Coordinates of C-alpha atoms and ligand atoms in Angstrom, one line a residue:
Chain A
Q1 CA 11.3 -16.3 -17.3
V2 CA 13.4 -15.1 -20.3
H3 CA 11.8 -11.7 -21.0
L4 CA 13.4 -8.4 -21.4
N5 CA 10.8 -6.6 -19.3
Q6 CA 10.1 -9.3 -16.6
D7 CA 8.1 -6.8 -14.4
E8 CA 5.6 -6.2 -17.2
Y9 CA 5.4 -9.8 -18.3
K10 CA 4.1 -10.3 -14.8
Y11 CA 1.3 -7.7 -15.0
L12 CA 0.2 -9.4 -18.1
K13 CA 0.0 -12.7 -16.1
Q14 CA -2.2 -10.8 -13.7
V15 CA -4.7 -9.8 -16.3
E16 CA -4.6 -13.3 -17.6
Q17 CA -5.5 -14.8 -14.3
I18 CA -8.3 -12.3 -13.7
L19 CA -9.6 -13.4 -17.0
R20 CA -8.9 -17.0 -16.2
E21 CA -10.2 -17.2 -12.7
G22 CA -12.1 -14.1 -11.7
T23 CA -15.8 -13.5 -10.8
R24 CA -18.2 -11.6 -13.0
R25 CA -20.5 -8.9 -11.9
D26 CA -22.5 -8.5 -15.2
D27 CA -24.9 -5.9 -16.6
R28 CA -26.3 -4.5 -19.8
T29 CA -25.3 -0.9 -19.3
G30 CA -22.1 -2.3 -20.8
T31 CA -20.3 -1.7 -17.5
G32 CA -19.7 -5.2 -16.3
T33 CA -16.5 -6.4 -14.5
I34 CA -14.4 -9.5 -14.0
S35 CA -12.7 -9.4 -10.6
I36 CA -10.0 -10.8 -8.3
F37 CA -10.0 -9.6 -4.7
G38 CA -6.5 -9.4 -3.4
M39 CA -3.5 -9.2 -5.7
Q40 CA 0.2 -8.1 -5.4
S41 CA 3.0 -7.2 -7.8
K42 CA 6.4 -5.8 -7.6
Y43 CA 8.4 -3.6 -9.9
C44 CA 12.1 -2.7 -9.8
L45 CA 12.9 1.0 -9.6
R46 CA 16.6 0.6 -9.9
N47 CA 18.8 2.5 -12.3
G48 CA 16.2 5.2 -12.9
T49 CA 13.5 2.9 -14.2
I50 CA 9.9 3.8 -14.1
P51 CA 7.2 1.2 -14.7
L52 CA 5.2 2.9 -17.4
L53 CA 3.6 0.1 -19.4
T54 CA 4.9 -0.4 -22.9
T55 CA 2.2 -2.8 -24.2
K56 CA -0.4 -0.1 -23.9
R57 CA 0.5 3.5 -23.7
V58 CA 0.1 5.5 -20.5
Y59 CA -0.7 9.2 -20.4
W60 CA 2.6 10.5 -19.0
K61 CA 1.6 14.2 -19.0
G62 CA -1.4 13.5 -16.8
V63 CA 0.5 11.2 -14.6
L64 CA 3.2 13.8 -14.4
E65 CA 0.9 16.9 -14.1
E66 CA -1.5 15.4 -11.6
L67 CA 1.2 14.1 -9.2
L68 CA 2.9 17.6 -9.0
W69 CA -0.5 19.1 -8.2
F70 CA -1.2 16.4 -5.6
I71 CA 2.0 17.3 -3.8
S72 CA 1.3 21.0 -4.2
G73 CA -1.7 20.4 -1.9
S74 CA -4.2 21.8 -4.4
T75 CA -7.9 20.9 -4.9
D76 CA -8.7 23.2 -7.8
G77 CA -9.0 21.1 -11.0
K78 CA -8.8 24.5 -12.8
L79 CA -5.0 24.6 -12.4
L80 CA -4.7 21.2 -13.9
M81 CA -6.8 22.1 -16.9
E82 CA -4.6 25.2 -17.6
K83 CA -2.0 22.6 -18.5
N84 CA -4.4 20.8 -20.7
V85 CA -4.8 17.8 -18.5
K86 CA -8.5 17.1 -18.2
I87 CA -8.7 13.9 -16.3
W88 CA -10.5 15.6 -13.4
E89 CA -12.8 17.6 -15.7
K90 CA -16.0 15.7 -15.4
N91 CA -15.8 15.6 -11.6
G92 CA -15.5 19.3 -11.2
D93 CA -17.9 20.8 -13.8
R94 CA -20.9 22.5 -12.2
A95 CA -23.3 19.7 -13.0
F96 CA -21.4 17.1 -11.0
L97 CA -21.1 19.5 -8.1
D98 CA -24.7 20.4 -7.9
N99 CA -25.9 16.8 -8.3
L100 CA -23.8 15.9 -5.3
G101 CA -25.4 18.7 -3.3
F102 CA -22.3 20.9 -3.5
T103 CA -24.3 23.9 -4.5
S104 CA -22.3 26.7 -2.8
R105 CA -19.2 25.7 -4.6
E106 CA -17.3 27.2 -7.5
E107 CA -16.4 25.1 -10.6
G108 CA -13.2 23.1 -9.9
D109 CA -13.6 22.7 -6.2
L110 CA -13.1 19.0 -5.7
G111 CA -13.1 19.3 -2.0
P112 CA -10.7 17.8 0.5
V113 CA -9.4 15.3 -2.0
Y114 CA -5.8 13.9 -2.1
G115 CA -3.7 17.0 -2.0
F116 CA -5.6 18.3 0.9
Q117 CA -5.2 15.1 3.0
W118 CA -1.6 14.6 2.1
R119 CA -0.5 18.0 3.3
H120 CA -3.2 19.0 5.7
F121 CA -4.9 15.8 7.2
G122 CA -7.4 17.0 9.7
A123 CA -7.5 20.7 8.9
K124 CA -10.9 22.2 8.5
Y125 CA -11.8 22.4 4.9
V126 CA -13.3 25.6 3.5
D127 CA -12.5 26.1 -0.2
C128 CA -9.8 25.7 -2.8
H129 CA -8.5 29.2 -2.4
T130 CA -8.0 29.0 1.4
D131 CA -4.5 29.1 2.7
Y132 CA -4.2 26.1 5.0
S133 CA -0.6 26.4 6.2
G134 CA 0.2 25.2 9.7
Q135 CA -3.2 23.6 9.6
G136 CA -3.6 19.8 9.8
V137 CA -0.8 17.2 9.7
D138 CA 1.5 17.5 6.6
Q139 CA 2.1 13.8 5.9
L140 CA 4.5 14.3 3.0
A141 CA 6.9 16.5 5.0
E142 CA 6.8 14.0 7.9
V143 CA 7.4 11.2 5.4
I144 CA 10.6 12.9 4.3
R145 CA 11.6 13.6 7.9
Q146 CA 11.4 9.8 8.7
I147 CA 13.3 8.5 5.7
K148 CA 16.2 11.0 6.5
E149 CA 16.1 10.8 10.3
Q150 CA 14.6 7.3 11.0
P151 CA 15.3 5.1 8.1
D152 CA 14.6 1.8 9.9
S153 CA 11.1 2.9 10.7
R154 CA 8.1 0.7 9.9
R155 CA 5.6 3.5 10.2
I156 CA 6.3 5.6 7.1
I157 CA 2.7 5.9 6.0
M158 CA 0.9 8.7 4.2
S159 CA -2.8 8.4 3.8
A160 CA -5.7 10.1 2.1
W161 CA -8.5 8.0 3.6
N162 CA -10.0 10.4 6.0
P163 CA -13.4 9.2 7.1
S164 CA -14.2 12.6 8.5
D165 CA -13.9 14.2 5.1
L166 CA -15.1 11.7 2.5
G167 CA -18.6 13.1 2.1
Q168 CA -17.2 16.4 1.0
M169 CA -15.1 14.8 -1.7
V170 CA -16.1 14.5 -5.4
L171 CA -14.7 11.1 -5.4
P172 CA -13.5 8.7 -2.6
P173 CA -9.8 7.9 -2.8
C174 CA -8.9 4.8 -4.8
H175 CA -5.2 4.9 -4.0
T176 CA -5.8 4.9 -0.3
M177 CA -2.5 4.9 1.6
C178 CA 1.1 4.1 1.0
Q179 CA 4.1 2.9 3.0
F180 CA 7.7 3.8 2.4
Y181 CA 10.5 1.6 3.5
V182 CA 14.2 1.8 3.4
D183 CA 16.6 -1.1 3.3
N184 CA 20.2 -1.1 2.3
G185 CA 20.1 2.5 1.3
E186 CA 17.4 2.1 -1.3
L187 CA 13.9 3.6 -1.0
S188 CA 10.8 1.5 -1.6
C189 CA 7.0 2.1 -1.7
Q190 CA 4.0 -0.1 -1.1
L191 CA 0.8 1.2 -2.4
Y192 CA -2.7 0.2 -1.4
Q193 CA -5.4 0.5 -4.1
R194 CA -8.9 -0.2 -3.0
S195 CA -10.1 -0.7 -6.6
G196 CA -8.5 -0.5 -10.0
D197 CA -9.2 -1.0 -13.8
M198 CA -6.3 -2.9 -15.2
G199 CA -6.5 -1.4 -18.7
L200 CA -6.7 2.2 -17.5
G201 CA -6.2 3.2 -13.8
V202 CA -4.0 0.5 -12.5
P203 CA -1.4 1.3 -15.2
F204 CA -1.6 5.1 -14.6
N205 CA -1.5 4.6 -10.9
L206 CA 1.5 2.4 -11.1
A207 CA 3.4 5.1 -13.0
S208 CA 2.3 7.8 -10.6
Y209 CA 3.7 6.1 -7.5
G210 CA 6.9 5.1 -9.3
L211 CA 7.5 8.8 -10.1
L212 CA 6.8 9.6 -6.4
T213 CA 9.4 7.2 -5.2
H214 CA 12.0 8.5 -7.6
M215 CA 11.2 12.1 -6.5
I216 CA 11.2 11.3 -2.8
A217 CA 14.5 9.4 -3.1
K218 CA 16.3 12.2 -4.8
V219 CA 15.2 14.4 -1.9
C220 CA 16.4 12.1 0.8
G221 CA 19.6 11.2 -1.0
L222 CA 18.8 7.6 -1.7
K223 CA 18.8 5.2 -4.6
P224 CA 15.3 3.9 -5.6
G225 CA 14.4 0.3 -4.9
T226 CA 11.1 -1.4 -5.5
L227 CA 7.4 -0.5 -5.8
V228 CA 4.9 -3.0 -4.4
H229 CA 1.5 -2.8 -5.9
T230 CA -1.2 -4.3 -3.8
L231 CA -4.7 -4.3 -5.2
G232 CA -8.0 -4.7 -3.3
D233 CA -10.4 -5.1 -6.3
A234 CA -8.4 -5.8 -9.3
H235 CA -10.8 -5.9 -12.2
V236 CA -11.3 -5.9 -15.9
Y237 CA -14.1 -4.5 -17.9
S238 CA -15.5 -7.4 -19.8
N239 CA -16.2 -5.4 -22.9
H240 CA -12.5 -5.0 -23.5
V241 CA -11.5 -8.6 -23.3
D242 CA -10.8 -8.4 -27.0
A243 CA -8.3 -5.6 -26.5
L244 CA -6.8 -7.1 -23.4
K245 CA -6.4 -10.3 -25.4
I246 CA -4.4 -8.6 -28.1
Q247 CA -2.3 -6.7 -25.5
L248 CA -1.5 -9.9 -23.6
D249 CA 0.1 -11.1 -26.8
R250 CA 2.6 -8.2 -27.3
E251 CA 6.1 -8.7 -26.0
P252 CA 7.0 -5.8 -23.8
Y253 CA 9.8 -3.4 -24.3
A254 CA 12.0 -2.0 -21.6
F255 CA 10.6 0.6 -19.2
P256 CA 11.7 4.2 -19.7
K257 CA 14.0 6.0 -17.3
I258 CA 13.4 9.1 -15.3
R259 CA 16.0 11.9 -15.4
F260 CA 15.9 14.9 -13.1
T261 CA 17.6 17.6 -15.0
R262 CA 18.4 20.0 -12.1
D263 CA 18.7 20.0 -8.3
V264 CA 15.7 20.2 -6.0
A265 CA 15.4 22.1 -2.7
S266 CA 12.5 20.0 -1.4
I267 CA 9.6 17.7 -2.6
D268 CA 7.8 21.0 -3.4
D269 CA 10.5 21.9 -5.9
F270 CA 9.8 19.7 -9.0
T271 CA 8.2 20.9 -12.3
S272 CA 7.2 19.7 -15.6
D273 CA 10.3 20.8 -17.5
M274 CA 12.8 19.2 -15.2
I275 CA 11.4 15.6 -15.2
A276 CA 12.6 13.8 -18.4
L277 CA 11.3 10.5 -19.6
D278 CA 13.9 8.8 -21.7
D279 CA 13.1 6.2 -24.3
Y280 CA 9.5 5.5 -23.7
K281 CA 9.1 2.9 -26.3
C282 CA 5.5 1.8 -26.9
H283 CA 3.4 -0.5 -29.0
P284 CA 0.9 0.8 -31.5
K285 CA -2.2 2.4 -30.1
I286 CA -4.8 -0.3 -29.5
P287 CA -8.0 -0.7 -31.5
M288 CA -10.9 -1.4 -29.3
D289 CA -10.3 0.4 -26.0
Chain B
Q1 CA 1.2 -31.6 -2.5
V2 CA -2.0 -32.6 -0.9
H3 CA -1.9 -30.8 2.3
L4 CA -4.9 -31.0 4.5
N5 CA -4.2 -27.4 5.5
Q6 CA -2.9 -25.8 2.3
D7 CA -3.5 -22.2 3.5
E8 CA -1.2 -22.7 6.5
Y9 CA 1.3 -24.8 4.6
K10 CA 1.7 -21.5 2.8
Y11 CA 2.5 -19.7 6.0
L12 CA 5.5 -22.0 6.5
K13 CA 6.8 -21.1 3.0
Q14 CA 6.1 -17.4 3.7
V15 CA 8.4 -17.6 6.6
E16 CA 10.8 -19.9 4.7
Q17 CA 11.0 -17.3 1.9
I18 CA 11.8 -14.6 4.4
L19 CA 14.5 -16.9 5.8
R20 CA 16.1 -17.5 2.5
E21 CA 15.3 -14.4 0.5
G22 CA 15.2 -11.8 3.1
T23 CA 17.0 -8.7 4.1
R24 CA 19.0 -8.5 7.3
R25 CA 18.9 -5.6 9.7
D26 CA 21.1 -7.1 12.4
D27 CA 21.8 -5.8 15.9
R28 CA 24.4 -6.6 18.6
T29 CA 21.9 -6.9 21.2
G30 CA 19.6 -9.8 20.2
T31 CA 16.6 -8.2 18.4
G32 CA 17.7 -8.5 14.8
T33 CA 15.3 -9.1 11.9
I34 CA 15.3 -10.8 8.6
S35 CA 12.7 -9.0 6.5
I36 CA 10.7 -8.9 3.2
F37 CA 8.9 -5.8 2.0
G38 CA 5.7 -6.7 0.2
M39 CA 3.8 -10.0 0.8
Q40 CA 0.4 -11.4 0.3
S41 CA -1.5 -14.4 1.6
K42 CA -5.1 -15.7 1.3
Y43 CA -7.1 -17.9 3.6
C44 CA -10.4 -19.8 3.1
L45 CA -13.1 -18.8 5.7
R46 CA -15.8 -21.1 4.3
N47 CA -17.9 -23.5 6.3
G48 CA -16.8 -22.1 9.7
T49 CA -13.0 -21.9 9.1
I50 CA -10.8 -19.5 10.9
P51 CA -7.0 -19.4 10.3
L52 CA -5.6 -20.1 13.8
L53 CA -2.3 -21.7 13.3
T54 CA -1.8 -25.3 14.3
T55 CA 2.0 -25.6 14.0
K56 CA 2.5 -23.0 16.7
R57 CA -0.4 -22.2 19.0
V58 CA -2.0 -18.8 19.0
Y59 CA -3.5 -17.1 22.1
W60 CA -7.2 -17.3 21.3
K61 CA -8.4 -15.9 24.6
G62 CA -6.3 -12.8 23.7
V63 CA -7.5 -12.8 20.1
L64 CA -11.2 -13.1 21.3
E65 CA -11.2 -10.7 24.2
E66 CA -9.2 -8.0 22.5
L67 CA -11.3 -8.0 19.3
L68 CA -14.5 -7.7 21.4
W69 CA -12.8 -4.8 23.2
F70 CA -11.8 -2.9 20.0
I71 CA -15.3 -3.0 18.7
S72 CA -16.8 -1.8 22.0
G73 CA -14.8 1.4 21.2
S74 CA -12.9 1.2 24.4
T75 CA -9.5 2.7 25.2
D76 CA -9.2 1.4 28.8
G77 CA -6.7 -1.5 29.0
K78 CA -7.9 -2.0 32.5
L79 CA -11.1 -3.5 31.1
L80 CA -9.0 -5.8 29.0
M81 CA -7.1 -6.8 32.1
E82 CA -10.1 -7.5 34.2
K83 CA -10.4 -10.5 32.0
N84 CA -6.8 -11.6 32.5
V85 CA -5.6 -10.7 29.0
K86 CA -2.3 -9.0 29.5
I87 CA -1.2 -8.0 26.0
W88 CA -1.8 -4.3 26.4
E89 CA -0.4 -4.2 30.0
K90 CA 3.1 -3.0 29.2
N91 CA 1.8 0.0 27.1
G92 CA -0.7 1.2 29.6
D93 CA 1.1 1.1 33.0
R94 CA 2.5 4.3 34.3
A95 CA 6.2 4.1 33.4
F96 CA 5.2 4.0 29.8
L97 CA 2.7 6.9 30.0
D98 CA 5.2 9.2 31.5
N99 CA 8.1 8.3 29.3
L100 CA 5.8 9.3 26.4
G101 CA 4.9 12.6 28.2
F102 CA 1.4 11.5 28.9
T103 CA 1.5 12.6 32.5
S104 CA -2.0 13.8 33.0
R105 CA -3.2 10.4 32.1
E106 CA -4.5 7.6 34.4
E107 CA -3.1 4.0 34.1
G108 CA -4.5 2.3 31.1
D109 CA -5.6 5.4 29.2
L110 CA -4.1 4.1 25.9
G111 CA -5.3 7.1 24.0
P112 CA -7.2 7.1 20.7
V113 CA -6.0 3.7 19.6
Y114 CA -8.0 1.3 17.5
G115 CA -11.4 1.4 19.2
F116 CA -11.5 5.2 19.2
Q117 CA -10.7 5.2 15.5
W118 CA -13.0 2.4 14.5
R119 CA -16.1 4.0 16.0
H120 CA -15.5 7.8 16.4
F121 CA -12.9 8.8 13.8
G122 CA -12.2 12.5 13.9
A123 CA -13.8 13.1 17.3
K124 CA -11.9 15.1 19.9
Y125 CA -10.1 12.8 22.4
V126 CA -10.2 13.6 26.0
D127 CA -10.0 10.4 28.1
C128 CA -11.1 6.8 28.3
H129 CA -14.0 7.4 30.6
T130 CA -15.6 9.9 28.1
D131 CA -18.8 9.3 26.3
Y132 CA -18.3 9.9 22.6
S133 CA -21.5 8.6 21.3
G134 CA -22.5 10.6 18.2
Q135 CA -19.1 12.1 18.0
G136 CA -16.9 11.3 15.0
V137 CA -17.5 8.8 12.3
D138 CA -18.6 5.3 13.3
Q139 CA -16.8 3.3 10.7
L140 CA -18.0 -0.1 11.8
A141 CA -21.6 1.0 11.6
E142 CA -20.9 2.4 8.1
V143 CA -19.1 -0.8 7.1
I144 CA -22.2 -2.8 8.0
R145 CA -24.6 -0.3 6.4
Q146 CA -22.8 -0.6 3.0
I147 CA -22.4 -4.4 3.1
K148 CA -26.1 -4.6 3.3
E149 CA -27.5 -1.7 1.4
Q150 CA -24.6 -1.6 -1.1
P151 CA -22.9 -5.1 -1.5
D152 CA -21.1 -4.1 -4.7
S153 CA -19.3 -1.1 -3.1
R154 CA -15.6 -1.1 -3.7
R155 CA -15.3 1.4 -0.8
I156 CA -16.1 -0.7 2.3
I157 CA -13.1 0.5 4.4
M158 CA -12.4 0.8 8.1
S159 CA -9.1 2.3 8.9
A160 CA -7.3 3.1 12.1
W161 CA -4.6 5.4 10.7
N162 CA -5.5 8.8 11.9
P163 CA -2.5 11.2 11.5
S164 CA -4.0 13.8 13.8
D165 CA -4.4 11.5 16.7
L166 CA -1.2 9.5 16.3
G167 CA 1.0 11.4 18.7
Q168 CA -1.4 10.8 21.5
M169 CA -1.3 7.0 21.0
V170 CA 0.7 4.7 23.1
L171 CA 1.4 2.6 20.0
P172 CA 1.0 3.3 16.3
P173 CA -1.6 1.1 14.6
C174 CA 0.1 -2.0 13.2
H175 CA -3.0 -3.2 11.4
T176 CA -3.7 0.0 9.5
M177 CA -6.9 -0.6 7.7
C178 CA -9.1 -3.2 6.0
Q179 CA -11.3 -3.5 3.0
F180 CA -14.5 -5.5 2.8
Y181 CA -15.8 -7.0 -0.4
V182 CA -18.8 -9.0 -1.3
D183 CA -19.0 -11.4 -4.2
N184 CA -21.4 -14.2 -4.5
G185 CA -23.1 -13.4 -1.2
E186 CA -19.9 -14.4 0.5
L187 CA -17.9 -11.8 2.3
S188 CA -14.1 -11.5 2.3
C189 CA -11.7 -9.1 4.0
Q190 CA -8.4 -7.7 3.0
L191 CA -6.1 -6.5 5.8
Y192 CA -3.3 -4.1 5.6
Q193 CA -0.5 -4.5 8.1
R194 CA 2.4 -2.0 8.0
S195 CA 4.7 -4.3 10.0
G196 CA 4.6 -7.8 11.6
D197 CA 6.4 -10.5 13.5
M198 CA 5.8 -13.7 11.6
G199 CA 5.8 -15.9 14.6
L200 CA 3.9 -13.9 17.1
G201 CA 1.9 -11.1 15.7
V202 CA 1.0 -12.0 12.2
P203 CA -0.6 -15.1 13.5
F204 CA -2.6 -13.3 16.2
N205 CA -3.5 -10.8 13.7
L206 CA -4.7 -13.4 11.2
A207 CA -7.1 -14.8 13.7
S208 CA -8.4 -11.5 14.8
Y209 CA -9.5 -10.3 11.4
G210 CA -10.8 -13.8 10.5
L211 CA -13.0 -13.7 13.6
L212 CA -14.1 -10.2 12.6
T213 CA -15.2 -11.4 9.2
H214 CA -17.2 -14.3 10.7
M215 CA -18.8 -11.8 13.1
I216 CA -19.6 -9.1 10.6
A217 CA -21.0 -11.7 8.1
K218 CA -23.4 -13.3 10.6
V219 CA -24.7 -9.8 11.3
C220 CA -25.3 -9.0 7.6
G221 CA -26.7 -12.4 6.7
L222 CA -23.8 -13.4 4.5
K223 CA -21.6 -16.4 4.1
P224 CA -17.9 -16.0 5.0
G225 CA -15.6 -15.9 2.0
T226 CA -11.9 -15.3 2.0
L227 CA -9.3 -13.4 4.1
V228 CA -6.5 -11.6 2.3
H229 CA -3.4 -10.9 4.4
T230 CA -1.1 -8.2 3.1
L231 CA 2.1 -7.1 4.9
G232 CA 4.5 -4.3 4.4
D233 CA 7.4 -5.2 6.6
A234 CA 7.2 -9.0 7.1
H235 CA 10.0 -10.1 9.4
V236 CA 11.4 -12.9 11.4
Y237 CA 13.5 -12.2 14.5
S238 CA 17.0 -13.5 14.1
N239 CA 17.1 -15.2 17.5
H240 CA 14.0 -17.3 16.8
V241 CA 15.3 -18.9 13.7
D242 CA 16.2 -22.1 15.4
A243 CA 12.5 -22.4 16.5
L244 CA 11.0 -21.5 13.2
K245 CA 13.0 -24.1 11.4
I246 CA 11.3 -26.8 13.4
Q247 CA 7.9 -25.1 13.0
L248 CA 8.5 -25.3 9.3
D249 CA 9.0 -29.0 9.7
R250 CA 5.7 -29.6 11.4
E251 CA 2.7 -30.6 9.3
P252 CA -0.5 -28.5 9.8
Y253 CA -3.7 -29.9 11.1
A254 CA -7.0 -28.7 9.8
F255 CA -8.0 -25.2 10.9
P256 CA -10.5 -25.0 13.7
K257 CA -14.1 -23.8 13.2
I258 CA -16.0 -21.0 14.9
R259 CA -19.5 -21.4 16.2
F260 CA -21.9 -18.7 17.5
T261 CA -24.2 -20.1 20.1
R262 CA -27.0 -17.5 20.2
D263 CA -28.3 -14.8 17.8
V264 CA -26.8 -11.3 17.7
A265 CA -28.6 -8.0 17.5
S266 CA -25.7 -6.0 16.1
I267 CA -22.0 -6.1 15.9
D268 CA -22.2 -4.7 19.4
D269 CA -23.8 -7.8 20.7
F270 CA -21.1 -10.5 20.8
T271 CA -19.6 -11.7 24.1
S272 CA -16.9 -14.2 25.0
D273 CA -19.3 -16.9 26.1
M274 CA -21.0 -17.3 22.8
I275 CA -18.1 -17.6 20.5
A276 CA -17.1 -21.2 20.4
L277 CA -13.8 -22.5 19.0
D278 CA -14.3 -26.1 18.0
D279 CA -11.4 -28.6 17.8
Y280 CA -8.3 -26.3 18.1
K281 CA -5.7 -29.0 17.5
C282 CA -2.1 -28.0 17.9
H283 CA 1.5 -29.1 18.1
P284 CA 3.4 -29.1 21.3
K285 CA 5.0 -25.8 22.5
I286 CA 8.4 -24.9 21.0
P287 CA 11.6 -25.8 22.9
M288 CA 13.3 -22.5 21.9
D289 CA 10.8 -19.6 21.5
Ligands
NOH301 O1 -8.5 2.4 -11.4 C1 -8.8 3.4 -11.0 N1 -7.9 4.2 -10.5 C2 -8.2 5.4 -10.0 N2 -7.3 6.2 -9.6 O2 -7.7 6.9 -8.7 C3 -9.5 5.9 -10.0 C4 -10.5 5.0 -10.4 N3 -10.1 3.8 -11.0 C5 -11.1 2.9 -11.5 C6 -11.4 1.9 -10.5 C7 -12.9 1.7 -10.7 O3 -13.0 1.2 -12.0 C8 -13.3 3.1 -10.8 C9 -13.6 3.6 -9.4 O4 -14.9 3.3 -9.1 P1 -15.1 2.9 -7.7 O5 -14.1 2.0 -7.0 O6 -16.5 2.1 -7.8 O7 -15.4 4.2 -6.8 O8 -12.3 3.8 -11.4
NOH302 O1 3.4 -8.1 14.6 C1 2.8 -7.3 15.2 N1 1.5 -7.2 15.2 C2 0.9 -6.3 15.9 N2 -0.4 -6.2 15.9 O2 -1.0 -5.7 17.0 C3 1.6 -5.4 16.7 C4 2.9 -5.4 16.7 N3 3.6 -6.4 15.9 C5 5.0 -6.5 15.9 C6 5.5 -6.0 14.6 C7 6.8 -5.3 15.0 O3 7.8 -6.2 15.2 C8 6.5 -4.7 16.3 C9 6.1 -3.2 16.2 O4 6.5 -2.7 15.0 P1 7.1 -1.3 15.1 O5 6.0 -0.4 15.8 O6 7.7 -0.8 13.9 O7 8.2 -1.5 16.3 O8 5.5 -5.6 16.9

């Protein structure tokens, strides 16, 4: 109970329990998992706090760069790489594309992935250079409309799971849908993750959606509230138990705060240089993985 | 702390926690809610079990008839009515259609609600007497194809949230999507519900998705596992508090068991007369509501 960072103490319990009571799907490719199906955690977003884990470092520049690019509607991993964020690099190089049958496609065309769904759900996908405006349903714009105009609503959902388009995507969505909620003048987010690695993706995903809620709040003139993180397949790679065991023994620091250093016109008006992360205090970089 | 029915003893606390920890959203006019954003619940489905609540009775004829109807792909609430299930009657009769602008629509054309999404996602909706076979993505067929050919998949997802078709729908989807997961040759389901009444709809919903998992499992040759119930807006109506306080008093009975009385060719081959609910033992009806 008596922890500075109580929200992170909790995530450490979650890993502990997956280790303690999860089921193994083993192998010898070295890719085996330990799994709990169905998990839920909450983090407080109040006072500018963003849940970037302090016990293991999170790649803030990729979290930061990739989210701006999601919102921007883009599906060219080329723009992302120009900023030296390479997390989408293996999924867009020519060998991945051709192996998937996507042989009429230029490098970096990831297909109708997240940005495309978020801002043009149901538009007809052509390529990453096509202008898709007025096409498909812009879910992010509508999300902003609802928080402002209909705060009590229980249908503030934005989704990237489009069954119609999933075969054209380089990967299926892993963060599948989210729900915003306003109560008492504070904005909240619940996120559904179909599947997540608890030493890599779940932590990066956590930080991505916290940033989104801080960004979306500033736009609708609300104070941020709580992020609910619901996991579908919350798993651990069993060849980092040693690392996760160390990390489970590190007392967390406080979470960093987000500062927006100028005014924004819309949710399309953030940039790298106006989002400040203050006091991201982190433990030493971990040995095994 | 030995409760015959632990999974439902939990339901009582769930409500109890909304009662004592929840957020008010009052109204003058008798429809006020006390609400918690972000909740999760698990239920055992092993050895025939199905989470139909014993402390307040659930309408099984409605659960049964309506789930069979979703699967069929149907959007005609007149079919649902022919069987004397009246849950969709309000939203399909003509004062509703017209007040939504759906004035070229016959009674009971509910639009592209759950069944149209579940079996023809992305198809072009015309009416409820239209043959859409081969049109759109059959998500239930795909869910079955994966459970069987690809049990390990972390992508077994059927979802009724289609932003393109939402405006043509008499009601937004409350149960927005679900994930399926196999471990141990036992099949579980995690349900996402954007919003829910904890004394009317969450318990009807619980039973529907539990019955679906028993049905889908029998078809794939798997044992039923566990049902994970996640809600976004989990709420209790303010007027029903007197009633829920008693219901919380009541001690649960063991959950009933489902039995299938003949073999099935597909998920399209269940009927009412072959799904048997054994020993649904319940408390008396509530003196308040
Ligand atoms: O944790 C993740 N977060 C992601 N963000 O999108 C993407 C992936 N992952 C992890 C989850 C699984 O380990 C893997 C996805 O593989 P899949 O669920 O089998 O498609 O990547
Ligand atoms: O609990 C529910 N379960 C449903 N499943 O079919 C459908 C509706 N409901 C309840 C939840 C809300 O109280 C209400 C609809 O939520 P709303 O669309 O935000 O009004 O009905």
